[PDB]
Amino acid sequence: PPGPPEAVTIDEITDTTAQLSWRPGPDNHSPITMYVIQARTPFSVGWQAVNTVPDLVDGKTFTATVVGLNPWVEYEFRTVAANVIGIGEPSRPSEKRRTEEALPEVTPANVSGGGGSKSELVITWETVPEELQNGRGFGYVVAFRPHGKMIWMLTVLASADASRYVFRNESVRPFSPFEVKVGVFNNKGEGPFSPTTLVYSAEEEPTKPPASIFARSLSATDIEVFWASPIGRGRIQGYEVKYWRHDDKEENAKKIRTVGNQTSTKITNLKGSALYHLSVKAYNSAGTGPSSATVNVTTRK
Numbered sequence: 035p036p037g038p039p040e041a042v043t044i045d046e047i048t049d050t051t052a053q054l055s056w057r058p059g060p061d062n063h064s065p066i067t068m069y070v071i072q073a074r075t076p077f078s079v080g081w082q083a084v085n086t087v088p089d090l091v092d093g094k095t096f097t098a099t100v101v102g103l104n105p106w107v108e109y110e111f112r113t114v115a116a117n118v119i120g121i122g123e124p125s126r127p128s129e130k131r132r133t134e135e136a137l138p139e140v141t142p143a144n145v146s147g148g149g150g151s152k153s154e155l156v157i158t159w160e161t162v163p164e165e166l167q168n169g170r171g172f173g174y175v176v177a178f179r180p181h182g183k184m185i186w187m188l189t190v191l192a193s194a195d196a197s198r199y200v201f202r203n204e205s206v207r208p209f210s211p212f213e214v215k216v217g218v219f220n221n222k223g224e225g226p227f228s229p230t231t232l233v234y235s236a237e238e239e240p241t242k243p244p245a246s247i248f249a250r251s252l253s254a255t256d257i258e259v260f261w262a263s264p265i266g267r268g269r270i271q272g273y274e275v276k277y278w279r280h281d282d283k284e285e286n287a288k289k290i291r292t293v294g295n296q297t298s299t300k301i302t303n304l305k306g307s308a309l310y311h312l313s314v315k316a317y318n319s320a321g322t323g324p325s326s327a328t329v330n331v332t333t334r335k
Contacts, residue, residue: 035062035064035117035119035120035121035122035123036059036060036061036062036064036066036115036116036117036122036123037059037060037061037062037115037122037123038059038114038115038122038123038124038125038126039056039057039058039059039069039113039114039115039122039125040056040057040058040059040125040126041055041056041057042054042055042056042111042112042113042125042126042127042128043055043056043128043129044109044111044128044129044131045097047109047131047132047133047134048133048134049103049105049106049133049134049135049136049168050101050102050103050104050105050133050136051099051100051101051103052099052100052103052109052111052131052133053097053098053099053100054071054097054098054099054100054111054113054128055096055097056069056096056097056113056125057096058093058096058115059115059122059123059125061115061117062117064117064118064119065093065117065118066093066115066116066117067092067093067116067117067118068090068091068092068093068115068116069091069092069093069095069096069098069113069114069115069116070083070091070113070114070116070121071083071084071086071091071098071100071111071112071113072084072111072112072113072114072124073100073103073109073110073111074109074110074111074112074127075104075107075108075109075110075165076107076108076165077107077163077164077165078165081112081124084100084101084102084103084111085100085101085102086098086099086100086101087099087100087101093115103133104133104165104166104168105133105134105135105136105168105169106132106133106134106135106136106167106168106169106170107132107133107165108130108131108132109130109131109132109133110127110128110129110130111127111128112124112125112126112127112128113125135168135169135170135220135221135222136168136169136222137168137220137222137223137224137225138162138166138167138168138169138172138218138219138220138222138223138225138226139166139168139225139226140162140163140166140218140225141162141216141217141218141225141226141227141228142159142160142161142162142174142216142218142228143159143160144158144159144160145157145158145159145214145215145216145228145229145231146158146159146231146233147214147233148233148234148319149236149237149319149320150200150202150235150236150319150320151236151320151321152208152236152238152239152320152321153202153203153204153206153236154200154201154202154206154235154236155178155200155201155202155206155212155233155235155236156198156199156200156233156235156236157176157178157198157199157200157201157214157216157233158197158198158199159174159197159198159216159228160197161194161195161196161197162194162218164194167194167218167220168220168222169220169221169222170220170221171219171220171221172194172218172219172220173190173191173192173193173194173196173218173219173220174190174191174194174196174216174217174218174219175188175189175190175191175216175217175218175219175224175227176188176189176190176191176199176214176216176217177214177215177216177217177227178201178212178213178214178215178233179212179213180210180211180212180213181210181211181212181213181232187201189201190219206235206236207235208235208236208237208238208320209234209235209236209237209238210234210235211232211233211234211235212232212233212234212235213230213231213232214230214231214232214233215227215228215229215230215231216228236319236320237268237269237318237319237320238268238320239268239317239318239320239321239322239323240264240267240268240269240270240315240316240317240318240321240322240323240324241266241267241268241323241324242264242265242266242267242268242316242323242324243264243314243315243316243323243324243325243326244261244262244263244264244273244314244315244316244326245261245262245264245265245326246260246261246262247259247260247261247262247312247313247314247326247327247329248260248261248329249312249329249331250331251331251332251333251334252300252334253306253333253334253335254304254305254306254307254333254334254335255302255303255304255305255306255333256300256301256302256304257300257301257304257310257331257333258298258299258300258301259275259298259299259300259301259312259314259329260297260298261273261297261298261314261326262297263297263316264316264323268316268318268323269318270316270317270318271293271317271318271319272291272292272293272294272296272316272317273291273292273297273299273314273315273316273317274289274290274291274292274314274315274316274317274322275289275290275291275292275299275301275312275313275314275315276288276289276312276313276314276315276325277289277301277310277311277312277313278310278311279305279308279309279310280308280309280310280311281308284311291317304333305333306333306334306335307332307333307334307335308332308333309330309331309332310330310331310332310333311328311329311330312328312329312330312331313325313326313327313328313329314326
């Protein structure tokens, strides 16, 4: 296998391209027939191969152009020569050198949203990776409009780390569809927008209480509670069961929550031969509804 090539230098650097040069290393009694070039950045995971011109570098070429680099990233480079035997030892790395800035080009992935409290529209996205921001002053532009309308409303978020925006206004009807895209910008200029997606605003909280509530004591620490769903009313994600010992204030109560359609539950780790008060509430992404009547049950022993 071949020895390490030497003297890797960065002769030119633009926003996405660099011109590199190097000098041959010992070939170890076998003809050197190829050079490959690797790059390392703070964000790459160690050394990676790069695209070059010529797309394949022979053993006679000691300089080459590297393409498809990220704007505004710090780069080191090294070269490796190859024999017929195998791949050689990597060179020592070149000096570090930062590419120039450019317009941003990558929009955030997984633009979505939903939920929230009354009068809200909740919009979420994944922050654009740092090696893809292409320059200082990187931020987002959240564009949203009611489905069926023409005017886009625009919010700027100066912070590259922003992953979430909440719009609240009386104009927002409950569970209404908005068209949503998220764009990017940096000091060099404005970049593209994500593909439009549909996001629904916050839904209405439950409006009716659970009915037909009662409980049964099983052991001295376990009771069972049953209710019926309300009739009419809102969407219901589960129930909040609220319980407290006869000797505590109601505001000291513990709460457990329920997910799905179960219209019953089981409370544990209670004190025996003691009275307990309970009440149930429906909830959804927007909050909780009215409370059932309070029911009274005593533990077994």
